[PDB]
C-alpha cells in the first residue's frame, strides 16, 4: 500500500500471507473461519503454497506464527484470465487455524448488501509502500 | 527497498462503477468494485488481500485486491473483486466441502 501506515500488530487478525515453497510472500488472503482462506484467483495458489497467519512484523522473531498447509485449492470456475473478472479463490486448510487474539475471521457480506460509493473502507497488506 | 517490515493499512473510499469506468473504461465488470484514487493505492504484493467495510460494527469483506495502477498511482482507483457478487459461490463451496 502506497501512502498507507503501519497497522497495530494483530489488529487485522484475518490477514494472512501466502508464501511459496521458498518462504517468499507472494499474495495476501483473509481467514473467513478456522479452515478457510479467501484470496484472489490471479495469485495462482497451489497446495505447495503455505498460509501464514498471525504475522504482522516480518522484522520480528517472537510472533506466534502459524504456518498452515493447504489441502485443496478452489478457484472460481468463472475466473477469466484476460479480464481478471471473478477473481476469487478459496483455500481449504489441511489443519485448522487456531484462533487467538491475533488470528480470527473477517465477516462475509450478503449478496444483497449495498456498500455505497463514498463509503470509507480499509485495505491492508504487505505490498510496496512506494512504486 | 519499498517492502514494508510491518503490515500496512490505509483508509480509502469506494467508487461507483460509473466513476471507476471514467478511469478504466470497459475493463470494469459487474464482479469488480473500485476504491481509492484518493491518495493511497494498493501495490505489488497486496494482491489477494482484503478490502473491508463496517457492517453492524464489524469489518466485512467487501473486496479482494485484484489489480490497479501500473505504477500504483494514488490518483487512480484500485480494482477489487466484488465479494457481494461472489459470496454466493463462497458459501456454496464451503457447504459442499
Amino acid at each position: 500500500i502506497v501512502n498507507g501506515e503501519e497497522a497495530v500488530p494483530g489488529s487485522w487478525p484475518w490477514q494472512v500471507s501466502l508464501q511459496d515453497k521458498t518462504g517468499f510472500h507472494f499474495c495476501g488472503g483473509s481467514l473467513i473461519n478456522e479452515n478457510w482462506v479467501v484470496t484472489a484467483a490471479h495469485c495462482g495458489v497451489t497446495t505447495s503454497d503455505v498460509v501464514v497467519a498471525g504475522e504482522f512484523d516480518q522484522g520480528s522473531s517472537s510472533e506466534k506464527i502459524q504456518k498452515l498447509k493447504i489441502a485443496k485449492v478452489f478457484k472460481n470456475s468463472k475466473y477469466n484470465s484476460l479480464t481478471i473478472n471473478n477473481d476469487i479463490t478459496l483455500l481449504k486448510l489441511s489443519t485448522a487455524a487456531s484462533f487467538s487474539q491475533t488470528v480470527s475471521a473477517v465477516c462475509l457480506p450478503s449478496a444483497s448488501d449495498d456498500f455505497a460509493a463514498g463509503t470509507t473502507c480499509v485495505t491492508t497488506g504487505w505490498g510496496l509502500t512506494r512504486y | 527497498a519499498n517492502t514494508p517490515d510491518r503490515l500496512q493499512q490505509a483508509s480509502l473510499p469506494l467508487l461507483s462503477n460509473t466513476n471507476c469506468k471514467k478511469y478504466w473504461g470497459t475493463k470494469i465488470k459487474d464482479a469488480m468494485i473500485c476504491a481509492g484514487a484518493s491518495g493511497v493505492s494498493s501495490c505489488m504484493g497486496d494482491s489477494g488481500g482484503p478490502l473491508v467495510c463496517k457492517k453492524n460494527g464489524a469489518w466485512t469483506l467487501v473486496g479482494i485486491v485484484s489489480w490497479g495502477s501500473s505504477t500504483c498511482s494514488t490518483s487512480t482507483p484500485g480494482v477489487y473483486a466484488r465479494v457481494t457478487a461472489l459470496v454466493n459461490w463462497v458459501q456454496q463451496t464451503l457447504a459442499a466441502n
Binding site: 501506515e5 465477516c107 | 483508509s11 466485512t60
Partner: peptide
C-alpha cells in the same frame, strides 16, 4: 467475525 480482539488504530501524523 470482523471484530479484532486488538482494535485497529487508523491514524496519520
Amino acid at each position: 467475525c470482523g471484530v479484532p480482539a486488538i482494535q485497529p488504530v487508523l491514524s496519520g501524523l
